[PDB]
Design a binder for this molecule. Structure first.
Ligand code: PAV
Ligand code: CL
Length: 321
């Protein structure tokens, strides 16, 4: 091995704290840290901003952390600080939301844009059919992950659902209050809207709540991505019939596991490599091209979760995160 477990520390950084998705991801990363005998600190800003993330990243670098695992608010905004981390000899991973691939080594991904876009579209089309007015409602027009998925989803919709119109795209800024206001405004301005597609953990519950507040629940289809602990009662009331995610606790755990392989065990992971992690399953390192990127380099790539999850009333109580 390259190191001893007790001498290392890893930083697990969310887009922001105080959102169930991120708390649960952090719990998974920390639990795996405990299982491996390595220290993992979960911390980040309380609002989603590039400058906030840069401040935390700089602090972790300056405290001589061995690895950073970040879900990014930006494609390029973290580049300078992540490059500084790499130069210091730190291992830089992303999870959830990627950065420019040259600025990290591995991205621990919940799925490709095609996988996730097809999920959003299929969950919607099962409920509204091939004709309707739809809106997209998510965090921000610049965040890496959601824009990768939505760009793909819009491409698929234009071709495969020519009788859908995307009437609007709105942003809730990872903020519950803003998201509720925006969601209510969608219903007030487009009272005949058929579905709102919400690939953001804050926008989706806000949209469900907006529908309930305005007595449009069960008239408008609301689907997207969020955590089951946040969505459970909306599903049981029937306001949301189905929505998607993936095991975010295992995602955080996988990030810690990979950091441990690299930093403690001294493994040199390459595209094409594969391994198994108990409680997660078999995973492999894929090229950056699976995300649409044009960059490849030795020891750089994407590790995708084996499965995603579609939650309905039939399985909502099978998941705790
Ligand atoms: C769950 C999600 O869609 O919302 C916040 C996360 O960063 C996410 O994965 O994009
Ligand atoms: Cl619905």
């Amino acid at each position: 091995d390259k190191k001893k477990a007790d001498d290392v520390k890893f930083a697990f950084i969310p887009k922001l704290t105080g959102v169930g998705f991120f708390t649960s991801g952090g719990e998974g990363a920390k639990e795996m840290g405990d299982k491996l005998g390595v220290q993992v600190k979960y911390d980040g800003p309380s609002e989603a901003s590039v400058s906030g993330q840069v401040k935390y990243i700089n602090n972790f670098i300056n405290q001589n952390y061995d690895a950073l695992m970040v879900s990014s608010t930006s494609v390029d905004g973290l580049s300078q600080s992540l490059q500084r981390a790499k130069k210091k000899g730190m291992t830089v991973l992303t999870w959830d939301s990627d950065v420019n691939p040259k600025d990290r080594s591995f991205y621990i991904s919940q799925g490709t844009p095609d996988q996730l876009a097809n999920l959003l579209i299929e969950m919607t089309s099962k409920q509204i059919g091939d004709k309707g007015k739809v809106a997209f409602f998510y965090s921000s027009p610049t965040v890496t992950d959601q824009n990768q998925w939505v760009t793909k989803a819009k491409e698929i919709i234009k071709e495969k659902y020519p009788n859908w119109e995307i009437v609007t795209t709105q942003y809730g800024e990872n903020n519950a209050q803003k998201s509720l206001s925006v969601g209510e405004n969608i219903l007030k301005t487009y009272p005949d809207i058929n579905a709102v597609i919400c690939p953001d953990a804050t926008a989706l519950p806000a949209m469900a709540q907006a529908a309930e507040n305005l007595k449009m629940d069960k008239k408008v289809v609301v689907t997207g991505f969020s955590t089951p602990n946040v969505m459970r009662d909306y599903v049981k009331r029937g306001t949301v019939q189905q929505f998607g995610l993936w095991d975010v606790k295992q995602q955080g755990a996988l990030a810690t596991y990979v950091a441990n392989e690299i930093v403690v065990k001294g493994k040199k992971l390459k595209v094409g490599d594969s391994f198994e992690v108990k409680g997660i399953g078999k995973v492999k390192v894929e090229p950056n091209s699976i995300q649409g990127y044009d960059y490849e380099a030795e020891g750089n790539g994407i590790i995708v979760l084996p499965e995603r999850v579609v939650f309905t009333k039939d399985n909502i109580d099978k998941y705790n995160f």
